[PDB]
């Protein structure tokens, strides 16, 4: 991508991830499951709706088309009219097409950056208690129950609690 997360170090996404746009896949001693993240999904939803609402509001019930008729000695004036309506037709088309292309691209990248930002947040939370596999997964140096997992997902990972255990497992 541009942030290199989507179709980058994380090669493809999860058809089993359905409850949101971004999130987790854990596999510990208890369970094994996909679970989407609340905050990053809501924030991106909030973002994109604001984006599309800010698209349907910027070209709105104004620039009109009264028709006009002209004689056969008003050929200049007739043309002048054509060139003006076509002119502004061309302009608004170009504006709309460009708008769509640009905002698309920025949308894609927005997701990309969003994902990375998630990975980076969990990463810099876990530190060296875990192993960076390079695939967008972390291999725990300790044991993480359906609880230590929930302590990661909501940004409440106690590093010092599992610090020494992961250490003893790491130097070995």
């Amino acid at each position: 991508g541009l942030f290199g997360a989507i179709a980058g170090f994380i090669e493809g996404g999860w058809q089993g991830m359905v409850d949101g746009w971004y999130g987790y896949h854990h596999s510990n001693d208890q369970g094994s499951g996909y679970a989407a993240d609340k905050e990053s999904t809501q924030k991106a939803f909030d973002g994109i709706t604001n984006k599309v609402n800010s698209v349907i509001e910027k070209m709105n019930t104004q620039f009109e088309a009264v028709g006009k008729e002209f004689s056969n000695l008003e050929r200049r004036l007739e043309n002048l009219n054509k060139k003006m309506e076509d002119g502004f037709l061309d302009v608004w088309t170009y504006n709309a097409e460009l708008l769509v292309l640009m905002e698309n691209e920025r949308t894609l990248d927005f997701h990309d950056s969003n994902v990375k930002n998630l990975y980076d947040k969990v990463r810099m939370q876990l530190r060296d208690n875990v192993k960076e596999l390079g695939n967008g997964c972390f291999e725990f140096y300790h044991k993480c129950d359906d609880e230590c997992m929930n302590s990661v997902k909501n940004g409440t990972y106690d590093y010092p609690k599992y610090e020494e255990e992961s250490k003893l497992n790491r130097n070995e």
Partner: protein, 109 residues
């Protein structure tokens, strides 16, 4: 423990909200209004030279010389002209002014 360096950015007391495409009401440190919405409400001169105040006279009223517009019989440079909407004093003797809107255009140069 640690000797320690930190990385951070400015914040302040600024309540100056701005908008972006993703967001609204976004509070920032530093902004710049780039759209003027204030005048004085007075009608002034312009590059020093004062406009031509027609008052209760229309352009014909002036150009022909309706007696009620006798002030306008001699006229210095103007920078623009201030004509009213339906000026009282125009064609005293009633009638018509041919191609008026094109004369009215010619005066704008």
């Amino acid at each position: 423990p640690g000797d320690q360096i930190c990385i951070g950015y400015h914040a302040n007391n600024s309540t100056e909200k701005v908008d972006t495409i993703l967001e609204r009401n976004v509070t920032v440190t530093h902004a710049k209004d780039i759209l003027e919405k204030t005048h004085n409400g007075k009608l002034c001169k312009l590059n020093g030279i004062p406009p031509l105040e027609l008052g209760d006279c229309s352009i014909a009223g002036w150009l022909l010389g309706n007696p009620e517009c006798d002030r306008l019989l001699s006229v210095p440079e103007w920078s623009y002209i201030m004509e009213k909407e339906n000026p009282r004093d125009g064609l005293c003797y009633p009638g018509s002014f041919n191609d008026y809107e094109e004369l009215k255009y010619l005066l704008s140069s």
